[PDB]
Design an enzyme around this catalytic site. Structure first.
Site, short mmCIF file in Angstrom:
data_model
loop_
_atom_site.label_atom_id
_atom_site.label_comp_id
_atom_site.label_asym_id
_atom_site.label_seq_id
_atom_site.Cartn_x
_atom_site.Cartn_y
_atom_site.Cartn_z
N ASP A 100 1.19 5.16 -8.80
CA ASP A 100 0.09 5.83 -8.10
C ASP A 100 0.17 7.28 -8.43
OD1 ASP A 100 -2.16 5.77 -6.43
OD2 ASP A 100 -0.91 6.37 -4.64
N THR A 101 -0.79 7.77 -9.17
CA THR A 101 -1.00 9.21 -9.34
C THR A 101 -1.93 9.73 -8.28
OG1 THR A 101 -2.73 8.74 -11.00
CG2 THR A 101 -0.55 9.31 -11.83
N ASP A 114 -3.72 7.72 -13.71
CA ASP A 114 -3.26 6.35 -13.79
C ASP A 114 -4.29 5.34 -14.31
OD1 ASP A 114 -4.75 5.92 -11.49
OD2 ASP A 114 -2.97 5.84 -10.13
N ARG A 150 -10.16 -4.05 -13.71
CA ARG A 150 -9.32 -3.20 -14.51
C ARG A 150 -8.16 -3.98 -15.07
NH1 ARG A 150 -8.25 1.67 -10.24
NH2 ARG A 150 -7.22 -0.16 -9.33
N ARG A 196 -5.52 0.18 -15.56
CA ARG A 196 -4.80 0.77 -14.45
C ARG A 196 -3.31 0.57 -14.65
NH1 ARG A 196 -2.13 2.49 -10.74
NH2 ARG A 196 -2.82 2.98 -8.62
N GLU A 245 -5.22 11.41 -6.79
CA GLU A 245 -6.57 11.50 -7.26
C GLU A 245 -6.82 12.95 -7.69
OE1 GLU A 245 -8.58 8.68 -7.37
OE2 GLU A 245 -6.87 7.51 -6.52
#
Ligand SMILES: Cc1cn([C@H]2C[C@H](OP(=O)(O)O)[C@@H](COP(=O)(O)O)O2)c(=O)[nH]c1=O
Ligand SMILES: [Ca+2]
Length: 129
Positions: free
Chosen positions: A34-35, A15, A75, A29, A37
């Site tokens: 939400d990917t 992401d 970001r 971002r 980690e």
């Protein structure tokens, strides 16, 4: 909303991606995503997916929403497109991201992305398997 040019500098993870935007290097971002980690389940697969999609693109574009354009970490916050295909949506449709971080006034593509998520979840893909 409006698409604007950018060029790939480097893939980072599912992401986040480093792009040159208005001639300056920035980490972007993905809005509303939400990917996992890299160190988590499906993290390496989400990283690889985004990496391939941005590296293979001839044309990267960013699209800011109506609200905040940069987060507290500096970001950029945007929807990213690769030859016209939204990365955020593509992740959702493959079950490699969850719709998340939905802040009011900066959520234009929420329902598009939720629809992709529902179809991934019906197929029991990846995160939903
Ligand atoms: C996607 C997004 C994240 N963020 C912040 C919230 C989270 O803060 P915290 O770092 O305090 O948890 C963090 C999640 O990003 P990551 O999922 O990249 O870690 O980024 C925003 O402020 N705006 C956004 O639109
Ligand atoms: Ca994440």
């Amino acid at each position: 909303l409006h698409k604007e040019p950018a060029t790939l500098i480097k893939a980072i993870d599912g992401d986040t991606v480093k792009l040159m935007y208005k001639g300056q290097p920035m980490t972007f971002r993905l809005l509303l995503e939400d990917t996992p980690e890299f160190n988590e389940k499906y993290g390496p697969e989400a990283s690889a997916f985004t990496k391939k999609m941005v590296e293979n693109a001839k044309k990267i574009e960013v699209e800011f929403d109506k609200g905040q354009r940069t987060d507290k970490y500096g970001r950029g916050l945007a929807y990213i497109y690769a030859d016209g295909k939204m990365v955020n949506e593509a992740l959702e449709r493959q079950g490699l991201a969850k719709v998340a971080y939905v802040y009011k006034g900066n959520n234009t593509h929420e329902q598009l992305l939720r629809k992709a998520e529902a179809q991934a979840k019906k197929e029991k893909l990846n995160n939903w398997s």
